[PDB]
Amino acid sequence: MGPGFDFAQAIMKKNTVIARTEKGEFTMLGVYDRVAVIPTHASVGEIIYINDVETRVLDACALRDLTDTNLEITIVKLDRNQKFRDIRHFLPRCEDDYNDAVLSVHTSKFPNMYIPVGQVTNYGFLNLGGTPTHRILMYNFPTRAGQCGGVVTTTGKVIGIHVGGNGAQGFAAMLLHSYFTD
Numbered sequence: 001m002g003p004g005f006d007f008a009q010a011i012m013k014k015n016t017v018i019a020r021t022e023k024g025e026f027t028m029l030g031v032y033d034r035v036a037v038i039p040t041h042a043s044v045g046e047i048i049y050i051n052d053v054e055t056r057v058l059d060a061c062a063l064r065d066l067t068d069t070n071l072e073i074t075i076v077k078l079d080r081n082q083k084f085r086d087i088r089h090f091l092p093r094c095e096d097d098y099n100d101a102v103l104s105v106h107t108s109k110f111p112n113m114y115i116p117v118g119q120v121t122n123y124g125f126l127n128l129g130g131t132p133t134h135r136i137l138m139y140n141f142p143t144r145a146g147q148c149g150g151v152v153t154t155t156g157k158v159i160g161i162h163v164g165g166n167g168a169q170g171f172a173a174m175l176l177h178s179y180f181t182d
Contacts, residue, residue: 008102008114015151026149033077069134070134073173087158095122100118100155103117120154
């Protein structure tokens with residue numbers, strides 16, 4: 001509908017896949033080569049479904065900060081026959097607040113879903129499902145079950161992936177350029 005939705009649609013149409021684990025279906029952001037991200041609570045194993053194709057997981061790493069605190073991001077390398085468009089240049093370098101973000105979701109249940117979530121706070125610490133978690137972004141939108149893995153964008157930046165909510169607010173794990181240095 002506007003330049004925010006334009007940037008979000010460009011990311012969704014080329015850099016997402018539908019990931020299915022034993023814990024359900026997630027929006028999964030592909031970042032470069034065969035490297036993607038997903039919320040750590042997806043519990044990625046040795047085999048994952050990617051757009052309903054049985055796919056070997058070559059590596060999975062649940063990220064923690066240097067205080068050894070959960071970040072709720074898992075980086076997956078997929079045994080896929082095709083690379084992702086490299087979008088690393090759209091990742092922020094530092095922790096930050098943002099204006100006017102869009103949360104975008106694409107699953108069997110919620111195809112082509114785009115949400116204007118508005119102002120994004122660098123919230124920091126959250127007790128997420130009883131797990132102390134750092135580098136959390138907050139937005140005042142009543143997000144719900146099925147939106148985990150959703151991509152959070154501003155114009156020009158891919159800033160986070162949706163990981164939870166409390167019924168009034170939604171919470172995203174930051175994406176930083178330093179996670180995807182090769």
